[PDB]
Amino acid sequence: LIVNVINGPSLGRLGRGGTTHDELVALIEREAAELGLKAVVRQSDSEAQLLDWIHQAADAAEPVILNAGGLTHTSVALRDACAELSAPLIEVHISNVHAREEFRRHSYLSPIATGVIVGLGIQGYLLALRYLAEH
Amino acid sequence: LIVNVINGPSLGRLGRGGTTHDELVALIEREAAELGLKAVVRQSDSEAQLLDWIHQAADAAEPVILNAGGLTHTSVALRDACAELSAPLIEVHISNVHAREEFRRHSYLSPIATGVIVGLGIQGYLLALRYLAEH
Amino acid sequence: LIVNVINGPSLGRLGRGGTTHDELVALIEREAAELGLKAVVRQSDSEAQLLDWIHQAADAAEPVILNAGGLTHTSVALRDACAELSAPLIEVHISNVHAREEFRRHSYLSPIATGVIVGLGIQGYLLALRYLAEH
Amino acid sequence: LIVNVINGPSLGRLGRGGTTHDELVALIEREAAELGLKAVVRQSDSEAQLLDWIHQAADAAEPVILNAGGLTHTSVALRDACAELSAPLIEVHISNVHAREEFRRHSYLSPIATGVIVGLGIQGYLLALRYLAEH
Amino acid sequence: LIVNVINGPSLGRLGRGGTTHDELVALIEREAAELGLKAVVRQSDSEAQLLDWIHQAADAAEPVILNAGGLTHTSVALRDACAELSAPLIEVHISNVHAREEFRRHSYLSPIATGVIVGLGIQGYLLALRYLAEH
Amino acid sequence: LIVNVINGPSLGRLGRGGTTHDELVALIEREAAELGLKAVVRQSDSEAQLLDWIHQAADAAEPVILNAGGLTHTSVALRDACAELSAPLIEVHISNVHAREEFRRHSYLSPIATGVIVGLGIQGYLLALRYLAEH
Amino acid sequence: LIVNVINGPSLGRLGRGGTTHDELVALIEREAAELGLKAVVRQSDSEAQLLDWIHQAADAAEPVILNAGGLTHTSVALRDACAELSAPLIEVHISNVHAREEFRRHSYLSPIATGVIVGLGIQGYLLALRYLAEH
Amino acid sequence: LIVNVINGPSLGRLGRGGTTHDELVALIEREAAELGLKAVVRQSDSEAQLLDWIHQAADAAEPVILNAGGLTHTSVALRDACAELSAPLIEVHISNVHAREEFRRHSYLSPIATGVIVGLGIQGYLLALRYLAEH
Amino acid sequence: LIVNVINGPSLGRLGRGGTTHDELVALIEREAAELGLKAVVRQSDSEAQLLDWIHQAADAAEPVILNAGGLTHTSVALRDACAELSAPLIEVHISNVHAREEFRRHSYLSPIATGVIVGLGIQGYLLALRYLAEH
Amino acid sequence: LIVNVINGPSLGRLGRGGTTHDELVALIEREAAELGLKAVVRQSDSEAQLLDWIHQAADAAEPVILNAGGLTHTSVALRDACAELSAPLIEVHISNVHAREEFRRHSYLSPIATGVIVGLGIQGYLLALRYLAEH
Amino acid sequence: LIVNVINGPSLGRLGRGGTTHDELVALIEREAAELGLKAVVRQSDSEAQLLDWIHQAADAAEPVILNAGGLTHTSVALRDACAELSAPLIEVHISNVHAREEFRRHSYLSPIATGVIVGLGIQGYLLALRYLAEH
Amino acid sequence: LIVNVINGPSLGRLGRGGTTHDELVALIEREAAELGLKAVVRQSDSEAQLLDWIHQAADAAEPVILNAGGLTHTSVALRDACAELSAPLIEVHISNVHAREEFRRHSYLSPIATGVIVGLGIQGYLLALRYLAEH
């Protein structure tokens, strides 16, 4: 029923691609409604903030769609917290990371994720919702 | 309107996971119909067969959903043929490759793909369709 | 006399292994009393919070027992702050990191630590206390 | 006219080298005045705090002199935020990093910086100002 | 009840740090007595001698505290013999190996050990005893 | 009082960026005058020529600003000669090397330099002068 | 009872070592008869052909002796198909690969094989038969 | 007298650079005539097809000009078959591979080739002919 | 006529897999008799002991079947002594090493061996005998 | 019309292969005449000499055929000077470098060259001429 | 006055190069006499034996000429024991190791040796003596 | 009879260790006289100068003692010229390179040298002479 969408740094800057973070929340909320889900979308540049939201979803046994931004490639902490999730974890990148710098082609999160969606824009979020609806 | 779904080796063996390759074709065909698309699904263990289907989609300017199996990690040829596509290319893995052997965590295809979906089972195919419908 | 015990992310989640973080504080406090020490145990998922506690121990010339969780493998910042400590620094892992992923077998902290204890469970904390008592 | 000087962890500890962080602010402020600039100097051990100050400078199209401390070698997030700056970005290290550990000889920031100054002490800040004044 | 302490090459040279190998045996024996344990301490520069003592402890299901010296970094054989132990294995280094040459930062033994203590001097032996007493 | 500016290959080709090597000499000479310094600027495509100028500055105990061009990444000889300097050595790159090929991101000179300035154009030379004036 | 012997490229060229591929089939057939086995020996330069023969042996639960030639070092596909076999898989090289180029010292097949025989000439095939007879 | 020109995948797509594969055959045939040679030009996306043509040239002791496309970087099989050629083998790339992705800068074929021509366009084929004519 | 079977550490522990080292000697002795061979089987955890047995076989020009255990991956000495053998050397592993840790996938012995048998259990010894009988 | 042929160290030693450097000049001069070109062939063991000849060809917008000998693998300087050429640059090796030491399989020049010819002997020079004539 | 010459495995096999180990002892003894030295030459295939002889020379403050054979590349233990020597340590290889396998081009002993002599045959021993005589 | 001693950069700076380059020439000349040799000692910071002296010794079939300084680690050219020598080549380092930076532990010259002497000071030159006298 409930799905957590968690955005790391600096996804607050979407727009500043026309879509803003707020537009994104709204798109996600609408699609969620359509799927009979409730989406809790949250963004933070703070690793610790993210860890806290992840722990919460671990305790509630809620699924997570997670776009960690740059922490994806760097944070073992975040990985460890996600590793505790018992519901599904979908990792999401808007851009195709494999078309950029080699360092972006590694993720500490993918191996503990259920699955990963990259390069499909903001629609990756919606497709992740839909996966979770049909599961 | 038309979408090519291309499966490499040995996706003919799905089932032998309950879903068979034929079931998969049927699921994909149904979803495609629902999206107002036509899906041409094709499978082959032959790299050359795949290259030929890719060239065709290049000439027709049709989008491709491609699950190359093991050739994903090994074939520059396949990459080169896909690199010619002008419509979108979605790379698909049923399993989460990042949860397996390190060698599976590299793909010659991802960097030239539009995007990539891994670990969402056979539903990755359907989600890829839906991306292409809304684009 | 005073010993700082510093726990990083997500050691707040011990339990959720039966021992909780609170139990851990209590075990450490009891052992410290027994050794004629005072233990100040502190936990945070915030790197910056940890850095601040480390700086404080640097200024006070107090010893530190530090379990950085995942930041152990990733944070040069933390290393740099610890590098300032003039009293002893004992690094502690509950689990044996060398029995897990290769990435966990490197630590930015070990080379500037006095010593390191891994894989002895929560008792590593108590043994670290005892080292510091007899020194 | 306005120049942002951003210091990461643990540059609050300069002194504790005689020069303190406050002295540094004052030196920078004086030189800035001399150049007909205004310097906004800010320090934080929080990656997120830094990201926020960087985003701000991105939105204001102000130049940044940035000394990220240890995050220089570890944070893709920070890199990504700096990558958004449209004014110049000068990276600054007080010490010569190339004379220390090999891990310090890589920086996620240098490739997106305008330029880099290392090993010239606190005077690197002043020289960076002067670059920006004559540009 | 019985604990095997096994020292490899060239721990016979402790002293030649004031503490000699004999002093070490005596310190260990005293602490063991205090814990209600019996310590069998043995040293050899011969890999084969060590393997034999390890096999013996495997057959007797006795715990081992093992300081292999340089064989720690080089001997798969020793690892394989330890891998047979069913009681606990604590690996011990007197010096902090992570503060020395990079080659010393790898150990064939750590991954099959219960845990590891480095850089706490000869007291690591005593702390290892105490772990085994409370277990 | 005296400062040696040493340019390697092929900095004779500056211009052929509008600034020519001669303009550069003149800019440097003017700034030097302004600082109460004398600048001896010299350029050569010959490694041996450069080594000779470096040895001379070693014997005279004069500071060197050195832009070695491509020899920066390749010449241990040059490093060894600079290693003899007892006055300061500032390494200078006009372009930001960290924004180019990976091979340019290593320098045999940086670790023995006092400091390094890259990506600030020809102004890096002038800023290096100014460092040396205030020191 | 039935054993599949599968030869990849270009084992059709044995002879062109006196033994030809046909001689090899005959030697294998004779030894098989002697062991109370039936040997189905098949050769192809086509990866896809091989995959098909492997799938067949997977479905029939027949053991495979496989000499993949150069695909041994390059084909994840082949590995994946073999990974499906439930009967034994013996990998065979006629030549000692470890005495040749470093690239030949890796095999995608060995880790999923039951065992491997290299450098014993064509007799490796016969010894593999005999293993399978006594099992 | 006879020269084999062998083109791998997907050199059938030349044109789709104006020159088509057919034009290429014709250019090669004309130049061959001019040199007093006969050129047999053949193309295939099938590795196995190529291997067969290579074996044939091995048996006939005919020289080969070979442009393997992407198999150049990936196929040990192809290398092994070429290694059997007793006449000359010239490797040909139309594009300069060293100006592209790092993975293209390795070739399994070069070390067993007589020589290699890259980046000279379709004229590399003609120059290879001419080498073989004057030899 | 005579064949040396040499077992390193800790193959004395076979059993402690039901087959003991003694059973193994007996199996080998019986098969040898059957082949018209005499088998001298010897085991030692001492590298030096093994070297001595290898030198002896070098001087006698007798073939060796050698299972070095862990020294296989670590000992250049052993390699060097085997390199002197003029009769055949068969390397034997009971387990499939390629299915274990990456470090076990390298052997200092394979490149100087005649051939290698891994993963066929104790029957690898018997098959090695049979190779040597038919040679 | 004019083509520069530049030979590095120690191509003065051709002969001391029967062909001497002088013969080579003469062969090149004759072929050039035949093509309606003028060839300026020059050789030097001095990197700086070569750089000077390269700069000259840059200023004159003349094409270069360059055989740098060992500097090919080592000199970034030379690369940088060639990178300035606006006419074509053909890199030439007489021997097949890919059949020798691994270090020779890298070239700082290839990526900035138009194309590369290796292993065709002195005829590579003549073929390079011919390329440049038909272009 | 006294010099220890220590030979590891399998230098007992010199001859079996005409010179035998005994001849070598005699050559060394004669040269030593000539230099006014006494040479104690000792050989063993046992690492532990060597360690014991090294410890002895450490305690006696005698210089060591050491040819460790294959242990040179593999033994940290031996390195550690040599690291204790306070008199000079000369490392000796008869053969030029840098002309053989890459693995032989690393030595755990060289960095703690006074110096190293390779590839001069048995005369390296005599030259090492002479160094020690004139020192 | 004649021996060439060749010193690269910056061995002209010996002294500026008390021994100067001139002293070194004199020591070498005296020892040479004593051995019934003539020593031609030559020094240059110019790679090309060295190459010329090496070519000369190649043509004269004279032995070379060569201390290339930093070019030892960097110059393939120099290696190639030495590779032509038919008399012996002894490589000499005054300092123990294996006790310094890792980059100094590789030499392009060692593998083509007869032998190598490092860390014995200027006496390495004299010992190299003596080797060549007794050969």
From Swiss-Prot, chains A, B, C, D, E, F, G, H, I, J, K, L:
S-S bridge residues: none
EC main group: lyase
Gene3D superfamilies per UniProt: Dehydroquinase, class II
Domain of life: Bacteria
GO BP, one annotated term: amino acid biosynthetic process
Keyword Amino-acid biosynthesis: yes
UniProt GO molecular function: 3-dehydroquinate dehydratase activity
InterPro entries found in the cross-reference section: DHquinase_II, DHquinase_II_CS, DHquinase_II_sf
Catalytic activity of the protein: 3-dehydroquinate = 3-dehydroshikimate + H2O
Chain positions recorded as substrate binding sites: 67, 73, 80, 94-95, 104
NCBIfam families per the UniProt record, alphabetical: aroQ (TIGR01088), PRK05395.1-2 (NF003805), PRK05395.1-3 (NF003806), PRK05395.1-4 (NF003807)
Functional summary from the UniProt entry: Catalyzes a trans-dehydration via an enolate intermediate.
Name the UniProt record assigns to this protein: 3-dehydroquinate dehydratase
Native organism: Mycobacterium tuberculosis (strain CDC 1551 / Oshkosh)
Gene: aroQ
